Amino acid sequence: IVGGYTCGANTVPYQVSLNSGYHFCGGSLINSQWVVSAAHCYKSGIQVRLGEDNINVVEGNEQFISASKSIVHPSYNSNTLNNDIMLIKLKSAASLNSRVASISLPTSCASAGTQCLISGWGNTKSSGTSYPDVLKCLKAPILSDSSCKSAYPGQITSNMFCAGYLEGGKDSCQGDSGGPVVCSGKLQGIVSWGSGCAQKNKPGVYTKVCNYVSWIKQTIASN
Numbered sequence: 001i002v003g004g005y006t007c008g009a010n011t012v013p014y015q016v017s018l019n020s021g022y023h024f025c026g027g028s029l030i031n032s033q034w035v036v037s038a039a040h041c042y043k044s045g046i047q048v049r050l051g052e053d054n055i056n057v058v059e060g061n062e063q064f065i066s067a068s069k070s071i072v073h074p075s076y077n078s079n080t081l082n083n084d085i086m087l088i089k090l091k092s093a094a095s096l097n098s099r100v101a102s103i104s105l106p107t108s109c110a111s112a113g114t115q116c117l118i119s120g121w122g123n124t125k126s127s128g129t130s131y132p133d134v135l136k137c138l139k140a141p142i143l144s145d146s147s148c149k150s151a152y153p154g155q156i157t158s159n160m161f162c163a164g165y166l167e168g169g170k171d172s173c174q175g176d177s178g179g180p181v182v183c184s185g186k187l188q189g190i191v192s193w194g195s196g197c198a199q200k201n202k203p204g205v206y207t208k209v210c211n212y213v214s215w216i217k218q219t220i221a222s223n
């Protein structure tokens, strides 16, 4: 997260860290045995780490659970990143409390201007790499479709939305991929891609979760 702030320990209880010997992506806990992340974060050997704040120190509240399986959207396109969403089922269910909790899926899409919270352990420099130990947060608004398409002509599909600041300086970045974009208590986006991090007129692009709720429900109901 570039231009963000320290969230504070366990203030974002649905945030998870996907780990393979190091943190490589974020994700969101939606029920005690399922996590939602981005399809481009897919790899084998994933351990899901819940209740984290400093990812390099065991401080208490952490639950490390292995992934039993990851389900990448069948229409995911790695070249356009269209349908960039993945579901991860946990080997055991997580113990939910106030430090570990799931987030609700939306019943309707969010509109432009909605203020959301983006969090993650990704890079904090727009020019270079500084990876934080603790969770960083950024409050950002959803932009209009016209400004988003004007910023990335021919690259935005109906399953994507832009959120951020056109003046540059505040944005999600590499390492934040797969994590949550929460607006009014509902998971509306997943960190997907952007051109560099916090560059002027190059906002972040997020997977539009309201377009996948029946797919998430049907897939969880059959696995």
Ligand SMILES: NC(=[NH2+])c1ccc2[nH]c(-c3cc(OC(F)(F)F)ccc3[O-])nc2c1
Residues within 6 Å of the ligand: 171, 172, 173, 174, 175, 176, 177, 191, 192, 193, 194, 195, 196, 197, 198, 203, 204, 205
């Ligand atoms: N500007 C943004 N809002 C943004 C957000 C997530 C990103 N994730 C990545 C990303 C970049 C990668 O390429 C690199 F390793 F060459 F930096 C790889 C994975 C990523 O998720 N870039 C990103 C940019």
Ligand SMILES: [Ca+2]
Residues within 6 Å of the ligand: 052, 053, 054, 055, 056, 057, 058, 059, 060, 062
């Ligand atoms: Ca820790």
Ligand SMILES: [Cl-]
Residues within 6 Å of the ligand: 149, 153, 154, 155
């Ligand atoms: Cl276009």
